[PDB]
Structure 1
Amino acid sequence: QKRAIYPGTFDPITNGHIDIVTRATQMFDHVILAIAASPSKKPMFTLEERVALAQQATAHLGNVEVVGFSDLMANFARNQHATVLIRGLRAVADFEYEMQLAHMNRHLMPELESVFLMPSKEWSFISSSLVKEVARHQGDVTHFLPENVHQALMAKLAVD
């Protein structure tokens, strides 16, 4: 029935993202966790690494499929026949930017309905950018990450 897309850079996937995609799969029949290449952001992890990490971290969720994309999100969503666009909404969100994006995406593909889900209190306050900054500066971020991502981040920073 409903095909939902949950797009982002997922660099790397965090426990907050796991929370959101878990809620989405309880609500919609099929969820595509869609990872944007985003070369302009100079991601810490390559697209291949991000896809592999997200695949492992969502392996227990049967109706999640992880796939990378390099086009405009709406162009990808259209070709994949998604009709629901999953967004996270939490306490520290840039709320107006999220409203900008939802209006732009409705302009681009009105048949794709933005829906906002809210994570647990535990994951309401921390961005993945702060997680990476803290880890790179020798702070403990294990609490925020799936174990496979924890291992990959330790290795990435060790060789960096």
Structure 2
Amino acid sequence: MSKTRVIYPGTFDPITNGHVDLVTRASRMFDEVVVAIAIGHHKNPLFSLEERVALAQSSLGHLSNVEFVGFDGLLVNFFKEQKATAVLRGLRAVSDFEYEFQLANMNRQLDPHFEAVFLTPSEQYSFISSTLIREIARLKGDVTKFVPQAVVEAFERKHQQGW
């Protein structure tokens, strides 16, 4: 009867209906969920940390047991700092599965308390990824069906400006 705390790390660049499904599913099984948004210094997220957090808070803030935090560094250092029970990840495809298996084993070797649990997407989100959504929006496609409305607007406002 100890409290459970799971971290869902990601770039969330941007958040999609698939991530929303995962976090909702997880919020029913664990006491606390942390949506952990990897800053990506030596990477190049299209959306800033502030935009990514706001887009996440706008789709998931209605769930009382969900928190939103930016992080960088080693996922296992964040894991220790957060006092987490586990990391959560979604597995969409075979390449996801192989990479995630390797990472779980590497993290367990860096921290023996480390744990990773996985969810499988509902089939209505199995074909949605952040990368593909970026590609369609860039080419002026409609992403309304795959992402929350606030993300649709954020793509319009990214066009409107230039950064």
The TM-score range, normalised by the shorter chain, is over 0.9
1:30 matched to 2:55: no
**2: CA distance between counterparts of 1:73 and 1:107?**
13
Shift of residue 18 of structure 1?
Answer: 0.5
Partner SS for 2:28: helix
1:103 maps to what in 2? Answer: 105
**1: CA distance between counterparts of 2:114 and 2:18?**
23
1:47 maps to what in 2? Answer: 49
Contact 1:11 / 1:44 at 8 angstroms: preserved in 2?
A: yes
Superposed CA RMSD: 1.3
Shift of residue 34 of structure 1?
Answer: 0.4
Q: Which runs of 5+ in 2 are unaligned?
A: none
Shift of residue 93 of structure 1?
Answer: 5.0
Contact 2:16 / 2:128 at 8 angstroms: preserved in 1?
A: no
Amino acid at match of 1:126: I
Amino acid at match of 1:3: R
Q: Which runs of 5+ in 1 are unaligned?
A: none
* Identity value in percent: 59
**1: CA distance between counterparts of 2:159 and 2:44?**
15
Runs of at least 4 residues off by over 4 Å? none
Amino acid at match of 1:110: P
**What is the aligned residue count?**
160
